[PDB]
Design a protein around this ligand. Structure first.
Ligand SMILES: O=C(O)CCCC[C@@H]1SC[C@@H]2NC(=O)N[C@@H]21
Ligand SMILES: O=C(O)CCCC[C@@H]1SC[C@@H]2NC(=O)N[C@@H]21
Ligand SMILES: O=C(O)CCCC[C@@H]1SC[C@@H]2NC(=O)N[C@@H]21
Ligand SMILES: O=C(O)CCCC[C@@H]1SC[C@@H]2NC(=O)N[C@@H]21
Lengths: 118, 117, 118, 118
């Protein structure tokens, strides 16, 4: 139920395919930041989750470079797929920008995105 | 520069090749935690970073399931590679465990790993 | 706008006094975790924030030790206060537990809390 | 043995006093970012840690306003004190800036500092 098109609270578009091998592949489109259009993503998920009602641990990465722009940054999302009536993917993320030594202390942003199919 | 074998402060081994497309592929072996053997990784990196000496942004994911165990979790490392006499990859990571919504507050660990050759 | 009673989404209760000082004092009641009753908090805030509409930066700390219990852990919330009809305090937090240096790779949890007047 | 003068890898200066009741007070001086001289800090620590060799959980806040400047930001450090030969405090920190609703996705930085007495 992870496969498909999801949207986060910012309006970004997350188009994913969950592979039988635990592979996550698709595209990301950010509604904010130093980005336009679609970027390649790749990630992994637990292809055999618990059955105690636990959610499904997953992760994916986007390097913010494509044919039109390069922000010299990468975001990783970590969280879990929670299926059911209201399916949702709950994440926290790290966005690291390429910096010089002077700026490394402030290289990494952290946040949380919530994805739904609606 | 990135392709190769890397070790972090915990004794884990990160084996990756950086494709020219900006794909990261490889294998991760953790020294600690609910793990044993190798796990598949995949990620992405800035295959055209700035010329000013900034580092190279990158990220990768490991779900902790292989033929041996399944921790029912995934880690994502977000960082940058820095070349030099001492090449380094400095990261921050998020380790999320599957949980019921009751314990979702405690699902996600945060940490930092430094990789070196 | 900061002083008073606030609630997050776990149902925890945050009772603060914002000192002229830049001081934050109060008590925290957490709904979830190895917790019981009220705990002392202390923190700091920008007592001269931007006029330009930006939020009011703040942070606080709770060590989870009181008369009833001691979880040997500490949470810090970092965030910002946002005035308006729906006042909110939007935070990210770090929960560190005391561990041996074996398990220290799993000592710190991260998450986010949104506090509302209701 | 938390009271005293500590330095992190950036060469910032962390002067702290741990009171009986679990209080933390002191002064923080950053070697980096939008800061100059000392800023008041405040926090909490577990005043009755385990004895199994586990470290002492602690956390503190700095709002980055003093008589010289104001960055409209606040940093929290969450971590633990670890005694012995190499007495150190290992932390993770969250640095939130006051932003408008629009740029809140980039309000929060994350990092880690290691404090030593040398
Ligand atoms: O600004 C950049 O460096 C690239 C764009 C980053 C957009 C971020 S990734 C985390 C968050 N979630 C989104 O949908 N967009 C932002
Ligand atoms: O215990 C688990 O749930 C799976 C193993 C996680 C090990 C972590 S991932 C971050 C850190 N870096 C490492 O090399 N190992 C730990
Ligand atoms: O160690 C424990 O379990 C006690 C910590 C309290 C639970 C956490 S603190 C962050 C989050 N926000 C809350 O209101 N509760 C949890
Ligand atoms: O907003 C600002 O730039 C002032 C924040 C101070 C810089 C930070 S706090 C985390 C890190 N550790 C330090 O000793 N300094 C930086």
């Amino acid at each position: 139920g992870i496969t498909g098109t999801w949207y986060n609270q910012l309006g970004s578009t997350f188009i994913v395919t969950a592979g039988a091998d635990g592979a996550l592949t698709g595209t990301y489109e950010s509604a904010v930041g130093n980005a336009e259009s679609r970027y390649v993503l790749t990630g992994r998920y637990d292809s055999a989750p618990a059955t105690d009602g636990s959610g499904t641990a997953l992760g994916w990465t986007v390097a913010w470079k494509n044919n039109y722009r390069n922000a010299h940054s990468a975001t990783t999302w970590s969280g879990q797929y929670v299926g059911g009536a209201e399916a949702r993917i709950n994440t926290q993320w790290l966005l690291t920008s390429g910096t010089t030594e002077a700026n490394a202390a402030k290289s990494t942003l952290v946040g949380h995105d919530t994805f739904t199919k609606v």
